Amino acid sequence: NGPEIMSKLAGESESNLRKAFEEAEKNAPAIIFIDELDAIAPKREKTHGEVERRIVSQLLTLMDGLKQRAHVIVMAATNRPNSIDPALRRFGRFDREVDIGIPDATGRLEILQIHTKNMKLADDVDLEQVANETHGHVGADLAALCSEAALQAIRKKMDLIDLEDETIDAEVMNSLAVTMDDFRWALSQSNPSALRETVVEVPQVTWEDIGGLEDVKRELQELVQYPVEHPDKFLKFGMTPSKGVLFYGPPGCGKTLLAKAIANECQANFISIKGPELLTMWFGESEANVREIFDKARQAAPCVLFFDELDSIAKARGGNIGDGGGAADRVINQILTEMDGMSTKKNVFIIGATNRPDIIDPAILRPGRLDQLIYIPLPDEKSRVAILKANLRKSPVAKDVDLEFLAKMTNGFSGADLTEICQRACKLAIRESIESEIRRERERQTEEDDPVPEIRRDHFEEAMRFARRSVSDNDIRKYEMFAQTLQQSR
Amino acid sequence: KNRPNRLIVDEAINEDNSVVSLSQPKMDELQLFRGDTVLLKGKKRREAVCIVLSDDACSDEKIRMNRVVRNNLRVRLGDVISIQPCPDVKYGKRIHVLPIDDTVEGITGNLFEVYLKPYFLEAYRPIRKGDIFLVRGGMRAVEFKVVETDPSPYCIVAPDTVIHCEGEPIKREDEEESLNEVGYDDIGGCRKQLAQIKEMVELPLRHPALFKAIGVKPPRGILLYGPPGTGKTLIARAVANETGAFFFLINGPEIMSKLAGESESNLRKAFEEAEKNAPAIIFIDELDAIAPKREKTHGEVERRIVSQLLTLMDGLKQRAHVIVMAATNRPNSIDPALRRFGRFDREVDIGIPDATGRLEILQIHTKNMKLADDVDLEQVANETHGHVGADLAALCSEAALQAIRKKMDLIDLEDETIDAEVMNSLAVTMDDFRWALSQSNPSALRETVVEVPQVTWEDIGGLEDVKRELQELVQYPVEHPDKFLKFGMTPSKGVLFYGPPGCGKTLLAKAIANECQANFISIKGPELLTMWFGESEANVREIFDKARQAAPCVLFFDELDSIAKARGGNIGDGGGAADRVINQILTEMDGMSTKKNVFIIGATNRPDIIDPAILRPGRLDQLIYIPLPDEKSRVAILKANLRKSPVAKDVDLEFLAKMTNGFSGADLTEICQRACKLAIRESIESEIRRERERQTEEDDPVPEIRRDHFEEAMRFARRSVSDNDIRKYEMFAQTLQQSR
Numbered sequence A: 001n002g003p004e005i006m007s008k009l010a011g012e013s014e015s016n017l018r019k020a021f022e023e024a025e026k027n028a029p030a031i032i033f034i035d036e037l038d039a040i041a042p043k044r045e046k047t048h049g050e051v052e053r054r055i056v057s058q059l060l061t062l063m064d065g066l067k068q069r070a071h072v073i074v075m076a077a078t079n080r081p082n083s084i085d086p087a088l089r090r091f092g093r094f095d096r097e098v099d100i101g102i103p104d105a106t107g108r109l110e111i112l113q114i115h116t117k118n119m120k121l122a123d124d125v126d127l128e129q130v131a132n133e134t135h136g137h138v139g140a141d142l143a144a145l146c147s148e149a150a151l152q153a154i155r156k157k158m159d160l161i162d163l164e165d166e167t168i169d170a171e172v173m174n175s176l177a178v179t180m181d182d183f184r185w186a187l188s189q190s191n192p193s194a195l196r197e198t199v200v201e202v203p204q205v206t207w208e209d210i211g212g213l214e215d216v217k218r219e220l221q222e223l224v225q226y227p228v229e230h231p232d233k234f235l236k237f238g239m240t241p242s243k244g245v246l247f248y249g250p251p252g253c254g255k256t257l258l259a260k261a262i263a264n265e266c267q268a269n270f271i272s273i274k275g276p277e278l279l280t281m282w283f284g285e286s287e288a289n290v291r292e293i294f295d296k297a298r299q300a301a302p303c304v305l306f307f308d309e310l311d312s313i314a315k316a317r318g319g320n321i322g323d324g325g326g327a328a329d330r331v332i333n334q335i336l337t338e339m340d341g342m343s344t345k346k347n348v349f350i351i352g353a354t355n356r357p358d359i360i361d362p363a364i365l366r367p368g369r370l371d372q373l374i375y376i377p378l379p380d381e382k383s384r385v386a387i388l389k390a391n392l393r394k395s396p397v398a399k400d401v402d403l404e405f406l407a408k409m410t411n412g413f414s415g416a417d418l419t420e421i422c423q424r425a426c427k428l429a430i431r432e433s434i435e436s437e438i439r440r441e442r443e444r445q446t447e448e449d450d451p452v453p454e455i456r457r458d459h460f461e462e463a464m465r466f467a468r469r470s471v472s473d474n475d476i477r478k479y480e481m482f483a484q485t486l487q488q489s490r
Numbered sequence B: 001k002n003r004p005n006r007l008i009v010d011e012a013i014n015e016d017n018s019v020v021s022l023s024q025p026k027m028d029e030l031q032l033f034r035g036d037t038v039l040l041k042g043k044k045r046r047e048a049v050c051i052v053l054s055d056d057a058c059s060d061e062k063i064r065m066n067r068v069v070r071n072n073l074r075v076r077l078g079d080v081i082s083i084q085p086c087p088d089v090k091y092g093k094r095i096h097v098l099p100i101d102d103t104v105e106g107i108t109g110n111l112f113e114v115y116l117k118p119y120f121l122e123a124y125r126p127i128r129k130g131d132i133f134l135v136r137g138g139m140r141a142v143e144f145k146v147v148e149t150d151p152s153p154y155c156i157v158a159p160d161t162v163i164h165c166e167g168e169p170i171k172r173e174d175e176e177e178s179l180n181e182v183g184y185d186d187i188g189g190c191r192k193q194l195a196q197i198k199e200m201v202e203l204p205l206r207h208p209a210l211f212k213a214i215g216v217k218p219p220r221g222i223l224l225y226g227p228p229g230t231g232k233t234l235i236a237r238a239v240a241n242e243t244g245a246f247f248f249l250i251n252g253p254e255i256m257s258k259l260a261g262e263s264e265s266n267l268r269k270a271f272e273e274a275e276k277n278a279p280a281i282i283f284i285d286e287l288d289a290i291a292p293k294r295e296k297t298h299g300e301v302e303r304r305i306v307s308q309l310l311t312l313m314d315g316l317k318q319r320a321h322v323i324v325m326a327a328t329n330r331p332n333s334i335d336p337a338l339r340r341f342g343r344f345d346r347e348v349d350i351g352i353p354d355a356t357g358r359l360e361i362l363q364i365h366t367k368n369m370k371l372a373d374d375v376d377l378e379q380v381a382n383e384t385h386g387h388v389g390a391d392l393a394a395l396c397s398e399a400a401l402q403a404i405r406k407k408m409d410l411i412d413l414e415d416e417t418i419d420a421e422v423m424n425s426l427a428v429t430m431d432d433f434r435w436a437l438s439q440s441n442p443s444a445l446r447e448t449v450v451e452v453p454q455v456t457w458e459d460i461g462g463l464e465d466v467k468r469e470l471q472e473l474v475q476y477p478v479e480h481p482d483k484f485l486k487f488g489m490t491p492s493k494g495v496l497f498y499g500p501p502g503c504g505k506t507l508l509a510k511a512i513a514n515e516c517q518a519n520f521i522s523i524k525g526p527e528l529l530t531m532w533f534g535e536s537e538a539n540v541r542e543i544f545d546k547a548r549q550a551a552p553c554v555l556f557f558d559e560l561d562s563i564a565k566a567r568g569g570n571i572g573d574g575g576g577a578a579d580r581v582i583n584q585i586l587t588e589m590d591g592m593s594t595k596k597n598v599f600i601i602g603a604t605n606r607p608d609i610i611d612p613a614i615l616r617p618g619r620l621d622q623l624i625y626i627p628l629p630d631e632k633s634r635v636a637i638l639k640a641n642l643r644k645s646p647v648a649k650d651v652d653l654e655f656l657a658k659m660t661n662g663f664s665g666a667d668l669t670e671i672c673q674r675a676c677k678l679a680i681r682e683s684i685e686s687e688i689r690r691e692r693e694r695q696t697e698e699d700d701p702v703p704e705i706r707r708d709h710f711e712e713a714m715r716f717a718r719r720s721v722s723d724n725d726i727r728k729y730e731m732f733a734q735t736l737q738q739s740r
């Protein structure tokens, strides 16, 4: 381990580093595990002392004295790959790199089952709730969560009931169940999640959730799945695959939803890069770390990179006019340079998105880059009904709700606004239920409990008064004006 | 004989060293009345005699007793005792008490007539042989042990029984501790922080054997941080003394002042010594001096010291009987290799006390000062905004030293040195505190304040629909989230108050933070402009981190459009939407824990120039328009602002409301304050006239603001808001669901 080597004197740290390798080579086959590698061998300029460089060189020459032996394997642990001396990450020394990374809902459920394996939980505790409510926790936090939950479940009772008794009884200790509220307490407070990192996983929205756009389904399925399934046809006909799409359209019609769905069906990871992230990299003026993202993509292949709000840099730089009025910027140039010079077949599929398709610089849709432009249209009646029922599919709804009349009534509304209508109708329903809870709580003396958990037509027909058209007519018109600049009428 | 006589000790609210407080169900169950002498048997065949009184905030197994009787019974807080009622003697014969040599040093004169004389007057208190009690006075606390009790073993106060006690200081027995040490009672403020530390170290330190019968890892790294001078070492000493664990103290400079090998040896010796005497606490204070940031280690020996501390902290996962607490100043000032799981995983923020906490600290330090009656500690506690515990300690010491330097030293002319009874006859004045608090005490605070505010719903005038909307948006979810789960709706975690300047946005947010009984972190407009101008927008994340260290909170990002309004407003710097700090606010808001009860509230005076990416769903999006107040609300505004000032009957608030229209509440408060200014000026003219009497009881300066002041200062009323302001506000309203 790193600190233990750096806590000794110079010659003695050299001797321990030598002794470890020779001892482990004596007892072949062996594994040597050096953890906290970035403490023992940091970056070159970060070695302010002299003894540090001698320790790094000693580790280097021992690692190069191991090409003779085939019975020793050396595994090391770091925090990020660009945090150690680049002389170590070369062929013959440290050539395989494995990224452990963050678990997901299934993985978090796995870890919680590991740590509560002998805890004697009650029946009401639902680990799925916890696993869905621990977004941003890694294994050590879940271990701390389980230990803290047990300690809460031993501090509030059955210690201050041990009054007649002096110490813990075995059978008493076994009779310790935990509640869902105990987990709600431990998970609510005192556990700061240790994650501000980008998440890479298989998403959970599927094709049944997006409403409509079935031609776009049979196009995305083609563009993503057709090549990677069976590339023999592409070889017989000699066509390179397209490694990009550019969704352009009005704001809030399901671009993110569509990309997450096509990442779901393909059963590949999904690295999302928001708009604020691009603005952060432009404002701090450190556009270098963009390459890191792509590197991360190649460490988690296959992926669907989703460069959402790709025009945000342009729209923040005066939009049409401002700063001379050129085309390219820092981060978009770096995206071009990283996209062009990447491995032509890894199943890494870059997907853009934009709300203003004209202000994006024309050098991005030249062939060999993301070029297969797809216009996401404003949803219509047969798709509006699907949108509405898919969003209501998680909420109770009665029979008198006329989704046909709802569709016919609302036109030129984006799906985001319809979801706003649904959620605000549910908000009014929630408010009505809390008024019913206060009335039936304020009983005459203070089993007719049912708060009517069914959202009646009144809520929808009242919250429909708060429906607002987020999209004008000239929006659709300039979108058609961009459409005619494509193969439709030109 | 087990059931009625077992309860657990806890903290006290009363200050008398003889009263024990029990809840009402137990005292009617136990068949006990007020005043009854009762007896407590504890550990190690020890006894305690006590008068009992009634209290409210307890359960049916909790007993509240002060530290003196708690140490008299040889038990500690959180343990169990046995409680039996006895019959009363209702007299005494000849008691005898002795002083302790450890407490009495440099006391001249006799201790009897000055201390024991006023103590047993009209307060019937029972005592037992062999106890230890404490008396406060003359800026000291003196211990007294009862040696001989003539009529019974336990005898109540009885003024016929004089005290014959003229003896030498008796040697304090070496197994028992003094009561001038530190305990939970000797820490003012920090109720929540003591709650967290007391629940964190109850089981490993009180019940060590329990953690040999289960595989469960208790937390072993605790990191205390807060401003310097907030008494962090004091908390550790307290917790050590109250759990009875061994306390070792390492400090930063002392380790860095030795040679290399010897600093390594002391750091090793401390851990092995404290591990020998389990259960123990190791307290390393000034952690940021012994283990700073990586790039800030210019030497080589520093890195060896940090690595030695690291490998000792990782050699402690085997042992469960050692806890390591450290103290720093801010969490991002130490090596990030320490703030990881297994080494320093729990972090506690002490922080600044508030008015109640400052009152607590001032009561702690003036506990034996013999103040006069006119001094009002509430005035001081309201007038010490920006002081932490060390400054209040310096304030009390400086006030006492002022109250001993201007008189009764230069009256000691015939006398040579200080007399005991003379020293006891030292009262302090409110003016003395005004002097000490006015000058020579630079407050050591430029930090953001986090606390529960003090304005309430009765102060804002009008806007009752906005009350029943904010109550919904803030309180509805956190009260009972079951309904939201049945209907599957995510809570809204934001509001955006938009409206004219000075109609009570800050007041409204502070009120909704008050009723919810949550902290309130305010982020002004100048702060955003500072972070944009210095171009260090990174530390915005720190603010949010602070929010999650003080949860629940109400972040109030006041003047959210100030960055835009300083960047040319409508036109300037190309003319985009987003800026640095607002982007950083989006990135920190989106990627935060979706349920912590951290509620972000914006505010703005120009709702159109704010960039449209902030009110997209999943962020602050529930826009609320704060309207210009009307008649029924103007009267409420006016009476609420006048509610702290004397006002007569002839003031026509109805005519005042009808007369002033299109005026924002800020301007009406300006009218009120300027009317009071004219009233003050008139009163000073009356004071000069009646001071310039004919020879130089008709004193009354007429402390009643007549109608003349209001009707004259009403000539200086100015409309801060035009008509086109209200019109473009309605133009923003029609861009919402009203008419679109």
Ligand SMILES: Nc1ncnc2c1ncn2[C@@H]1O[C@H](COP(=O)(O)OP(=O)(O)O)[C@@H](O)[C@H]1O
Residues within 6 Å of the ligand: A209, A210, A211, A212, A250, A251, A252, A253, A254, A255, A256, A257, A308, A387, A390, A391, A414, A415, A416, A419
């Ligand atoms: N076809 C659709 N099916 C289901 N939900 C949709 C659909 N279109 C939009 N939504 C709603 O819109 C939101 C996604 O908006 P999105 O398209 O990501 O915005 P943007 O275009 O700014 O990226 C989701 O909350 C979702 O509820």
Ligand SMILES: Nc1ncnc2c1ncn2[C@@H]1O[C@H](COP(=O)(O)OP(=O)(O)O)[C@@H](O)[C@H]1O
Residues within 6 Å of the ligand: B186, B187, B188, B189, B190, B229, B230, B231, B232, B233, B234, B361, B364, B388, B389, B390, B391, B393
């Ligand atoms: N909450 C508090 N209650 C009582 N005293 C306090 C409190 N906060 C600070 N003080 C006082 O301020 C001082 C804090 O300084 P510090 O350096 O922590 O003390 P120490 O001398 O123990 O290292 C102590 O003298 C303590 O009496």
Ligand SMILES: Nc1ncnc2c1ncn2[C@@H]1O[C@H](COP(=O)(O)OP(=O)(O)O)[C@@H](O)[C@H]1O
Residues within 6 Å of the ligand: B459, B460, B461, B462, B500, B501, B502, B503, B504, B505, B506, B507, B558, B637, B640, B641, B664, B665, B666, B669
């Ligand atoms: N409804 C109200 N009730 C009581 N006081 C108010 C009210 N509205 C405004 N005030 C006065 O206005 C001031 C607060 O102004 P504020 O709304 O914070 O300004 P801004 O809108 O620039 O943030 C306070 O001094 C308060 O006296």
